[PDB]
Ligand binder design. Structure first.
Ligand SMILES: [Ca+2]
Ligand SMILES: [Ca+2]
Length: 279
């Protein structure tokens, strides 16, 4: 399959080189996989989700995404137009309030929730969780992310937007998950992207067009935008049977475009998520 005039990030993950416009992907498109978007919620009614999104848990008064961030990230995972894995199932877990903020206890609870809830879902190709969030280092947040991964969920987490070593942020600093840095359309590390030894992979994160609340779209930037590219890619690859939740991060790193990025500090991987699609 080929989506013409795709968002640059989708084109980038299906190319060895920057600057293309078409997103090439196997038509399986993540069908049979499930991705939990642990964030401000998902506006499931957005037409771009085609009925494939649903809220499954909220830690606030409503499950509505009153912010947009979660909807955006979900769209990068799996919306029709903006998504990596265009046929995946999206499950929203609202751990962040409508200002985009959440207490660590709530974020932890939401991770534990996913680890359990997945057992009630039909996800034959496997389960991913996309965590476009983070704060300062917290062993308990890291341990929750590690538990989620151990439970059999491919956990992708944002590296953070502090232009610093992700070792001081959580869940970015949890080794066992897939910690995602952000790049721009010119294959530079995004100016805000954290870096460091704990990064596993980079994905497009600067000026990412996706869904937004109110049935809208908008382009925003962040490691939060890079993370769902990787989450979606994992779902896609798992549907293709190329990898499993346990191994998807390593598989994505092993099959990534290597050395394409600039402004990568010594000690940080120079690996950009790539679907290796061949028509
Ligand atoms: Ca290249
Ligand atoms: Ca890791």
């Amino acid at each position: 399959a080929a989506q013409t005039n795709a968002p640059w990030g989708l084109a980038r993950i299906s190319s060895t080189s920057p600057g293309t416009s078409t997103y090439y992907y196997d038509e399986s498109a993540g069908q049979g996989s499930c991705v939990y978007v642990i964030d401000t919620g998902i506006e499931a009614s957005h037409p771009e989700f085609e009925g494939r999104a649903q809220m499954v848990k909220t830690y606030y008064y409503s499950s509505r995404d009153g912010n947009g961030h979660g909807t955006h990230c979900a769209g990068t995972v799996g919306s029709r137009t903006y998504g990596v894995a265009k046929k995946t199932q999206l499950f929203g877990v609202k751990v962040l309030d409508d200002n985009g903020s959440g207490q660590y206890s709530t974020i932890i609870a939401g991770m534990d929730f996913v680890a359990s809830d997945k057992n009630n879902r039909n996800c034959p190709k496997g389960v991913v969780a996309s965590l476009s969030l983070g704060g300062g280092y917290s062993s308990s947040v890291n341990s929750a992310a590690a538990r989620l991964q151990s439970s059999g969920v491919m956990v992708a987490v944002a590296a953070g937007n502090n232009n610093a070593d992700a070792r001081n942020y959580s869940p970015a600093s949890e080794p066992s998950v897939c910690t995602v840095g952000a790049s721009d359309r010119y294959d530079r590390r995004s100016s805000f992207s954290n870096y460091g030894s704990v990064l596993d992979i980079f994905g497009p994160g600067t000026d990412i067009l996706s869904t937004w609340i109110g049935g809208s779209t908008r382009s925003i930037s962040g490691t939060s935008m890079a993370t769902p590219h990787v989450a979606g890619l994992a779902a896609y690859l798992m549907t293709l049977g190329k990898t499993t939740a346990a191994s998807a991060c390593r598989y994505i790193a092993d099959t990534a475009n290597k050395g394409d990025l600039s402004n990568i500090p010594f000690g940080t991987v120079n690996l950009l998520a790539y679907n290796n699609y061949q028509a």
